[PDB]
């Protein structure tokens, strides 16, 4: 070759890259419980059977719980705004619990929300307050 002949001849050197070992021994990255329980001497499919978890959901072409309990372990384990709360205080002190009067009201209930909207927000308000 023309260009390769110069690169071998020059005193610049070549951008030598040794990256063939890393193409096989790939570290697991996305789960810490797996990161501890993964034998790199074994293959992909062999590591899955060792754990318990399925490696393939289809019937595979060709031929052929210590860890899974720890995954079930990690499976065992919103408020309202200041204006919204203060606005609900105005409605409750005015009417009480008359939602029909509350939604036919114009001065306090400006955005013409339904009975179901106002009462739901009042239930959340009655949890944080009286």
């Amino acid at each position: 070759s023309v260009r390769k002949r110069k690169m071998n001849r020059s005193s610049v050197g070549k951008a030598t890259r040794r990256n063939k070992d890393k193409q096989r021994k790939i570290n697991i990255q996305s789960n810490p419980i797996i990161a501890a329980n993964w034998d790199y001497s074994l293959t992909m499919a062999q590591n899955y059977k060792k754990l318990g978890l399925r490696a393939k959901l289809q019937t595979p072409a060709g031929g052929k719980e210590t860890e899974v309990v720890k995954k079930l372990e990690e499976l065992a384990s919103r408020s309202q705004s200041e204006r919204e709360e203060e606005w609900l205080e105005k409605l409750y002190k005015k009417h009480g619990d008359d939602y029909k009067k509350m939604f036919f009201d114009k001065k306090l209930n400006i955005y013409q929300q339904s009975e179901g909207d106002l009462k739901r927000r009042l239930l959340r308000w009655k949890k944080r307050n009286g």
Binding site: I26, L57, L72
Partner: protein, 108 residues
């Protein structure tokens, strides 16, 4: 004249590709849960094979939603139709069994 000298090479290529996908998609099983489908044409109708994707109907009957189905790794097809009754039953049972097996991790 092409020669496939790389038959051994490309199997090692494909295996390492699956190995990377295993490393990156750590707890998940590399591929999506595909349906069970009856093949077309008089010659092949006795054969029952892996289909592309389920349906909105099969997904809805299983007890989950279409957009959510894809996030849990169920392949969903929208152009496929549920004409046969036996195929419909077999796929619904396949999903319900799959839903008993899955362990969906929390987002916290």
């Amino acid at each position: 004249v092409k020669v496939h000298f790389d038959q051994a090479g490309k199997k090692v290529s494909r295996r390492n590709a699956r190995a990377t996908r295993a490393a990156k998609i750590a707890p998940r099983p590399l591929d999506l849960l595909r349906p069970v489908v009856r093949a077309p044409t008089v010659k092949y109708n006795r054969k029952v094979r892996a289909g592309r994707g389920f349906t909105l109907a099969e997904v809805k009957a299983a007890g989950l939603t279409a957009a959510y189905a894809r996030t849990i790794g169920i392949a969903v097809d929208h152009r496929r139709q549920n004409r046969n009754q036996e195929i419909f039953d077999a796929n619904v049972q396949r999903l319900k069994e799959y839903q008993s097996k899955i362990i969906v991790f929390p987002r916290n």
